[PDB]
Design an enzyme around this catalytic site. Structure first.
Site, mmCIF file in Angstrom:
data_model
loop_
_atom_site.group_PDB
_atom_site.id
_atom_site.type_symbol
_atom_site.label_atom_id
_atom_site.label_comp_id
_atom_site.label_asym_id
_atom_site.label_seq_id
_atom_site.Cartn_x
_atom_site.Cartn_y
_atom_site.Cartn_z
ATOM 1 N N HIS A 44 -46.505 -29.927 67.979
ATOM 2 C CA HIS A 44 -45.406 -29.530 68.461
ATOM 3 C C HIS A 44 -45.931 -27.892 69.272
ATOM 4 C CE1 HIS A 44 -46.740 -26.885 64.351
ATOM 5 N NE2 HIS A 44 -46.047 -25.563 65.487
ATOM 6 N N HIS A 73 -46.271 -24.875 69.693
ATOM 7 C CA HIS A 73 -46.306 -23.498 68.860
ATOM 8 C C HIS A 73 -48.172 -23.529 69.224
ATOM 9 C CE1 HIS A 73 -43.052 -22.460 66.124
ATOM 10 N NE2 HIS A 73 -43.032 -21.819 67.005
ATOM 11 N N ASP A 117 -51.188 -22.732 67.949
ATOM 12 C CA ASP A 117 -51.794 -24.154 66.720
ATOM 13 C C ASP A 117 -51.743 -25.061 66.997
ATOM 14 O OD1 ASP A 117 -48.909 -22.958 65.811
ATOM 15 O OD2 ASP A 117 -49.610 -23.854 63.424
ATOM 16 N N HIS A 151 -40.247 -27.759 60.756
ATOM 17 C CA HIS A 151 -40.503 -26.955 61.317
ATOM 18 C C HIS A 151 -40.320 -26.408 62.329
ATOM 19 C CE1 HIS A 151 -44.101 -24.021 62.133
ATOM 20 N NE2 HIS A 151 -44.311 -24.368 62.877
ATOM 21 N N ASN A 159 -43.779 -19.924 58.821
ATOM 22 C CA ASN A 159 -43.742 -19.071 59.730
ATOM 23 C C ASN A 159 -42.199 -20.009 60.078
ATOM 24 O OD1 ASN A 159 -42.551 -17.781 61.788
ATOM 25 N ND2 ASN A 159 -44.619 -17.197 62.065
HETATM 26 C C1 LIG Z 1 -47.714 -16.757 54.730
HETATM 27 O O1 LIG Z 1 -47.836 -17.340 55.930
HETATM 28 C C2 LIG Z 1 -47.735 -18.498 56.995
HETATM 29 C C3 LIG Z 1 -47.090 -18.775 58.045
HETATM 30 C C4 LIG Z 1 -47.724 -19.758 58.495
HETATM 31 C C5 LIG Z 1 -47.943 -20.314 60.019
HETATM 32 C C6 LIG Z 1 -47.242 -20.845 60.601
HETATM 33 C C7 LIG Z 1 -47.053 -22.063 60.193
HETATM 34 O O2 LIG Z 1 -45.693 -22.196 58.987
HETATM 35 O O3 LIG Z 1 -46.577 -23.305 60.782
HETATM 36 N N1 LIG Z 1 -46.820 -20.792 61.986
HETATM 37 C C8 LIG Z 1 -47.643 -20.375 62.176
HETATM 38 C C9 LIG Z 1 -47.515 -19.293 63.277
HETATM 39 C C10 LIG Z 1 -48.076 -20.067 64.404
HETATM 40 C C11 LIG Z 1 -48.627 -19.505 65.929
HETATM 41 N N2 LIG Z 1 -45.985 -19.842 64.883
HETATM 42 C C12 LIG Z 1 -45.738 -18.425 65.983
HETATM 43 C C13 LIG Z 1 -44.238 -18.778 65.642
HETATM 44 C C14 LIG Z 1 -43.635 -18.669 67.501
HETATM 45 C C15 LIG Z 1 -42.727 -17.581 66.845
HETATM 46 C C16 LIG Z 1 -42.390 -16.855 67.809
HETATM 47 N N3 LIG Z 1 -41.338 -15.693 67.503
HETATM 48 C C17 LIG Z 1 -42.650 -16.807 65.709
HETATM 49 O O4 LIG Z 1 -43.854 -19.731 64.942
HETATM 50 C C18 LIG Z 1 -45.055 -20.212 64.411
HETATM 51 O O5 LIG Z 1 -44.992 -21.176 63.696
HETATM 52 C C19 LIG Z 1 -48.474 -17.895 63.422
HETATM 53 C C20 LIG Z 1 -48.383 -17.364 62.273
HETATM 54 C C21 LIG Z 1 -48.184 -17.765 61.010
HETATM 55 C C22 LIG Z 1 -47.514 -19.647 60.314
HETATM 56 C C23 LIG Z 1 -48.626 -21.491 57.772
HETATM 57 C C24 LIG Z 1 -48.637 -20.403 56.463
HETATM 58 N N4 LIG Z 1 -48.147 -19.350 56.391
HETATM 59 ZN ZN LIG Z 2 -45.829 -23.977 64.534
HETATM 60 ZN ZN LIG Z 3 -48.443 -24.574 62.039
#
Ligand SMILES: COc1cc(-c2c(C(=O)O)[nH]c3c([C@H](C)N4C[C@]5(C[C@@H](CN)C5)OC4=O)cccc23)ccn1
Ligand SMILES: [Zn+2]
Ligand SMILES: [Zn+2]
Length: 232
Positions: free
Chosen positions: A85, A87, A89, A150, A181
């Site tokens: 995807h 993002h 990561d 997601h 997230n």
């Molecule tokens: C207990 O907290 C978590 C958090 C995550 C987690 C996941 C996931 O769940 O895949 N992805 C994360 C990201 C990624 C890079 N971004 C950022 C973003 C784009 C939006 C911009 N406004 C916000 O959205 C997203 O996914 C960052 C920090 C933590 C996570 C996993 C497990 N536990």
């Molecule tokens: Zn993501």
């Molecule tokens: Zn992720």
């Protein structure tokens, strides 16, 4: 020393590999985001005398470290990468990969979203994945679009030789009470997308989440449960 490597066990900037099955590894790295530290996974699949990479290691320096760790531990060239995807990561590090000779791929949906949001952009478009339930072959894997979860573009990856299901961020680890997230998620469609995965890959033996510990098929139902409860 053999256990799956965890967030406080990996300094940001280092990468560790974990053997999942013959010719299948996960990669694990750590990154800071909004003032907290998180682990994340990707996949490496042996493709004859080459390697297919699934997802970056969440950042440029992490991804350079990933390439070095692969050379140390495996010693075969990474020739292609797929991002599951848009993002950071998943695509942060694509510029590093591309400058290292790796051909980078993602769906057109992922490419558009990455471009719009200012994330690094894979070079090549993966057609044939635009409708939920679509599947295409890519080297030693099958790519599957389950529907929005997601994110709207999230792909999953199956390794048929090993019955390994890489769910990416559409799938959460068993210890998670929370749906991670959800900024770009579709909570309403997510359980339906997971049910599609469950139907399509009933013989999966290992299920790998986008973040956290691999397990078995229970990760899928657990994910559906956590998402429904979050929405509730
Ligand atoms: C207990 O907290 C978590 C958090 C995550 C987690 C996941 C996931 O769940 O895949 N992805 C994360 C990201 C990624 C890079 N971004 C950022 C973003 C784009 C939006 C911009 N406004 C916000 O959205 C997203 O996914 C960052 C920090 C933590 C996570 C996993 C497990 N536990
Ligand atoms: Zn993501
Ligand atoms: Zn992720």
């Amino acid at each position: 020393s053999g256990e799956y490597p965890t967030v406080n066990e990996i300094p940001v900037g280092e990468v560790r590999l974990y053997q999942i099955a013959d010719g299948v590894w996960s990669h694990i790295a750590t990154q800071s985001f909004d003032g907290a530290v998180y682990p994340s996974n990707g996949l490496i699949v042996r493709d004859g005398d080459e390697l297919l990479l699934i997802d970056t290691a969440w950042g440029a320096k992490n991804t350079a470290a990933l390439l070095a760790e692969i050379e140390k531990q495996i010693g075969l060239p990474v020739t292609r990468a797929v991002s599951t995807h848009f993002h950071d990561d998943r695509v942060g590090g694509v510029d590093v990969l591309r400058a290292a000779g790796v051909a980078t791929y993602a769906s057109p949906s992922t490419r558009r979203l990455a471009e719009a949001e200012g994330n690094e952009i894979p070079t090549h478009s993966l057609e044939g994945l635009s409708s939920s339930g679509d599947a295409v072959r890519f080297g030693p894997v099958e790519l599957f679009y389950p529907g929005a979860a997601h994110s709207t573009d999230n792909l999953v990856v199956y390794v048929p030789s090993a019955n390994v299901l890489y769910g990416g961020c559409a799938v959460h680890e068993l210890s998670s009470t929370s749906a991670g997230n959800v900024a770009d998620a579709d909570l309403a469609e997510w359980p339906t997308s997971v049910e599609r995965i469950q139907k399509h890959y009933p013989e999966a033996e290992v299920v790998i989440p986008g973040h956290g510990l691999p397990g078995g098929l229970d990760l899928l139902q657990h994910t559906a449960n956590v998402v429904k409860a979050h929405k509730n």
